[PDB]
Structure 1
Amino acid sequence: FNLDTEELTAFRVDSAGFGDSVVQYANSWVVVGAPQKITAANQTGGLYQCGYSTGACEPIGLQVPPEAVNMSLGLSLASTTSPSQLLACGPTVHHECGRNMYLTGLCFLLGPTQLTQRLPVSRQECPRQEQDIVFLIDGSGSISSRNFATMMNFVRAVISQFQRPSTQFSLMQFSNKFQTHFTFEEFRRSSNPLSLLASVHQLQGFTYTATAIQNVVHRLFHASYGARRDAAKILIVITDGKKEGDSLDYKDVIPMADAAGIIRYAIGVGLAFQNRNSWKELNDIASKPSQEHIFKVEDFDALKDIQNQLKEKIFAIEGTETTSSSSFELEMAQEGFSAVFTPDGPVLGAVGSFTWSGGAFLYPPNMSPTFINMSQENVDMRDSYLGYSTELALWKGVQSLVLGAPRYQHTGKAVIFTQVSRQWRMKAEVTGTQIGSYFGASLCSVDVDSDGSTDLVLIGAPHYYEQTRGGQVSVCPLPRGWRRWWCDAVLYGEQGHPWGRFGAALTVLGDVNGDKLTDVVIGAPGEEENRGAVYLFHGVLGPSISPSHSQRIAGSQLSSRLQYFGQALSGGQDLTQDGLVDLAVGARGQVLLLRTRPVLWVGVSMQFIPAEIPRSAFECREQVVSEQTLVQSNICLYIDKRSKNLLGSRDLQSSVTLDLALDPGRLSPRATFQETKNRSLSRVRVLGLKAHCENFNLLLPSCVEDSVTPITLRLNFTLVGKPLLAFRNLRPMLAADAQRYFTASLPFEKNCGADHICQDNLGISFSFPGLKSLLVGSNLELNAEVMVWNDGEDSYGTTITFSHPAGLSYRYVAEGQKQGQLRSLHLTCDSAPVGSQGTWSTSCRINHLIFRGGAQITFLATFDVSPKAVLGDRLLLTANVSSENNTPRTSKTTFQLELPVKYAVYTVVSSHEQFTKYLNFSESEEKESHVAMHRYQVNNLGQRDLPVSINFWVPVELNQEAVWMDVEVSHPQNPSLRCSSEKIAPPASDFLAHIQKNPVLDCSIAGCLRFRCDVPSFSVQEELDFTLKGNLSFGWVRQILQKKVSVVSVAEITFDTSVYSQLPGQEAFMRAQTTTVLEK
Structure 2
Amino acid sequence: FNLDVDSPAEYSGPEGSYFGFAVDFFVPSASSRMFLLVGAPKANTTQPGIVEGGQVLKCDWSSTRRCQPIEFDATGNRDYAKDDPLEFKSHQWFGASVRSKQDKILACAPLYHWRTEMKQEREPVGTCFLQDGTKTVEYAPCRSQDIDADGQGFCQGGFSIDFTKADRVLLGGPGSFYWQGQLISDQVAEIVSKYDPNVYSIKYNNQLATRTAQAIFDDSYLGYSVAVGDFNGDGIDDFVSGVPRAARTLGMVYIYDGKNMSSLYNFTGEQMAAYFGFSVAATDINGDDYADVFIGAPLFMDRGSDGKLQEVGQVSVSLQRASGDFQTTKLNGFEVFARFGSAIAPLGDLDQDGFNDIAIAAPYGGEDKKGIVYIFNGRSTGLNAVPSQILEGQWAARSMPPSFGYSMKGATDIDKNGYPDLIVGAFGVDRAILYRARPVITVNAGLEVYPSILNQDNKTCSLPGTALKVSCFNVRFCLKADGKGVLPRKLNFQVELLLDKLKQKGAIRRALFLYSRSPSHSKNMTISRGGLMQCEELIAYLRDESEFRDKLTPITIFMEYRLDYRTAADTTGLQPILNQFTPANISRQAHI
TM-score range, shorter chain: 0.7 to 0.9
Q: Output one character per residue of 1:880-916: Cα deviation in whole Å (capped at 9) or x when no partner.
A: xxxxxxxxxxxxxxxxxxxxxxxxxxxxxxxxxxxxx
The match for 2:437 among 590, 596, 601 is 596
Match of residue 115 from structure 2: 96
1:413 correspondence with 2:252: yes
Q: Which one-letter code corresponds to 1:687 in the other structure?
A: I
Q: Output one character per residue of 1:938-969: Cα deviation in whole Å (capped at 9) or x when no partner.
A: xxxxxxxxxxxxxxxxxxxxxxxxxxxxxxxx
The match for 1:48 among 52, 57, 65 is 57
Deviation at 1:576, TM superposition (A): 3.5
2-structure distance, mates of 1:438, 1:109? 30
In the alignment of these two chains, the number of paired residues is 528
Match of residue 527 from structure 1: 365
Match of residue 577 from structure 2: 733
Instruction: Give the 5 Å matches for 1:207-606.
Output: 328-344=150-166, 345-364=168-187, 365-366=189-190, 368-373=205-210, 376=213, 380-394=216-230, 397-408=235-246, 409-419=248-258, 423-449=260-286, 453-454=290-291, 456-466=292-302, 467-478=309-320, 480-481=322-323, 483=325, 485=326, 487-488=328-329, 490-495=330-335, 498-528=336-366, 530-542=369-381, 544-556=382-394, 563-587=402-426, 588=428, 589-606=430-447
Q: Which one-letter code corresponds to 2:514 in the other structure?
A: Q
Contact 1:12 1:590 in 2 (8 A): yes
Taking every aligned residue pair, what percent have the same amino acid on both sides? Answer: 27
2-structure distance, mates of 1:732, 1:75? 36
Contact 1:671 1:698 in 2 (8 A): yes
Match of residue 41 from structure 2: 35
Instruction: Give the root-mean-square deviation of aligned CA atoms.
Output: 2.8
Change (3 A) 1:125 1:37: farther
Match of residue 100 from structure 2: 79
Contact 2:290 2:321 in 1 (8 A): no
Change (3 A) 1:559 1:510: farther
Q: Which one-letter code corresponds to 1:102 in the other structure?
A: E
Instruction: Give the 5 Å matches for 1:909-988.
Output: none
1-structure distance, mates of 2:5, 2:131? 32
Match of residue 306 from structure 2: none
Contact 2:60 2:66 in 1 (8 A): yes
Contact 2:478 2:534 in 1 (8 A): yes
2-structure distance, mates of 1:437, 1:508? 22
2-structure distance, mates of 1:625, 1:524? 71
Query: Which protein has the bigger helix share?
Result: 1
Task: Give the structure, 1 or 2, with the largest relative contact order (CA under 8 Å, sep 6 or more).
Answer: 2
Q: Which one-letter code corresponds to 1:601 in the other structure?
A: T
Instruction: Give the 5 Å matches for 1:694-709.
Output: 694-703=536-545, 705=549, 709=553
Contact 1:469 1:494 in 2 (8 A): no
Contact 1:672 1:699 in 2 (8 A): yes
Change (3 A) 1:595 1:614: same
Q: Which one-letter code corresponds to 2:442 in the other structure?
A: W
Contact 2:155 2:176 in 1 (8 A): yes
Change (3 A) 1:385 1:87: same
1-structure distance, mates of 2:93, 2:357? 33
Deviation at 1:707, TM superposition (A): 5.3
Match of residue 227 from structure 1: none
1:632 correspondence with 2:468: no
Match of residue 519 from structure 2: 679
Instruction: Give the 5 Å matches for 1:1022-1041.
Output: none
Highest Rg: 1 or 2?
Answer: 1
Q: Which one-letter code corresponds to 1:740 in the other structure?
A: A
Instruction: Give the 5 Å matches for 1:995-1006.
Output: none
Contact 2:377 2:387 in 1 (8 A): yes
Change (3 A) 1:34 1:534: same
Contact 1:626 1:702 in 2 (8 A): no
Q: Which one-letter code corresponds to 2:25 in the other structure?
A: Q
Q: Output one character per residue of 1:346-391: Cα deviation in whole Å (capped at 9) or x when no partner.
A: 1111211111112211112426243343773x65432111111110
Contact 2:474 2:540 in 1 (8 A): yes
Deviation at 1:439, TM superposition (A): 0.4
What SS is found at the alignment partner of 2:44?
strand
Deviation at 1:669, TM superposition (A): 3.1
The match for 1:117 among 137, 143, 146 is 137
Q: Which one-letter code corresponds to 1:60 in the other structure?
A: I
Q: Output one character per residue of 1:15-67: Cα deviation in whole Å (capped at 9) or x when no partner.
A: 51111111122171111111112223235111101011031211112225635
Larger mean Cα displacement after TM superposition, 712-721 or 61-70 = 61-70
2-structure distance, mates of 1:51, 1:594? 15
Match of residue 153 from structure 1: none
2-structure distance, mates of 1:382, 1:126? 17
Long gaps (5+) in structure 2: 28-32, 79-86, 191-203, 303-308, 461-465
Deviation at 1:4, TM superposition (A): 1.6
Deviation at 1:592, TM superposition (A): 0.3
What SS is found at the alignment partner of 2:457?
helix
Deviation at 1:468, TM superposition (A): 4.5
Match of residue 1077 from structure 1: none
What SS is found at the alignment partner of 2:5?
strand
1-structure distance, mates of 2:377, 2:481? 23
Deviation at 1:609, TM superposition (A): 3.2
Change (3 A) 1:374 1:682: farther
What SS is found at the alignment partner of 2:411?
strand
2-structure distance, mates of 1:486, 1:411? 20
Match of residue 107 from structure 1: 128
Consecutive aligned runs of 4 or more in structure 1 exceeding 6 Å deviation: 558-562
Deviation at 1:90, TM superposition (A): 0.6
Deviation at 1:616, TM superposition (A): 2.2
2-structure distance, mates of 1:424, 1:363? 12
Q: Which one-letter code corresponds to 1:736 in the other structure?
A: Q
Change (3 A) 1:126 1:510: closer
Contact 1:75 1:90 in 2 (8 A): yes
Q: Which one-letter code corresponds to 1:394 in the other structure?
A: D
Change (3 A) 1:331 1:560: closer
Contact 2:314 2:332 in 1 (8 A): yes
Q: Which one-letter code corresponds to 2:433 in the other structure?
A: L
What SS is found at the alignment partner of 2:352?
coil
| TM-score using structure 2 length | 0.82
Change (3 A) 1:64 1:328: farther
Contact 1:618 1:702 in 2 (8 A): no
Q: Which one-letter code corresponds to 1:403 in the other structure?
A: S
Match of residue 63 from structure 1: 73
Deviation at 1:570, TM superposition (A): 0.5
Change (3 A) 1:725 1:42: closer
Contact 1:73 1:90 in 2 (8 A): yes
Contact 1:686 1:692 in 2 (8 A): no
Deviation at 1:530, TM superposition (A): 4.7
Instruction: Give the 5 Å matches for 1:589-988.
Output: 589-613=430-454, 616-617=457-458, 627-640=469-482, 643-646=483-486, 650-666=487-503, 667=507, 669-689=509-529, 690-703=532-545, 705=549, 709-724=553-568, 726-748=570-592
Deviation at 1:400, TM superposition (A): 1.4
What SS is found at the alignment partner of 2:538?
strand
Q: Which one-letter code corresponds to 2:137 in the other structure?
A: Q
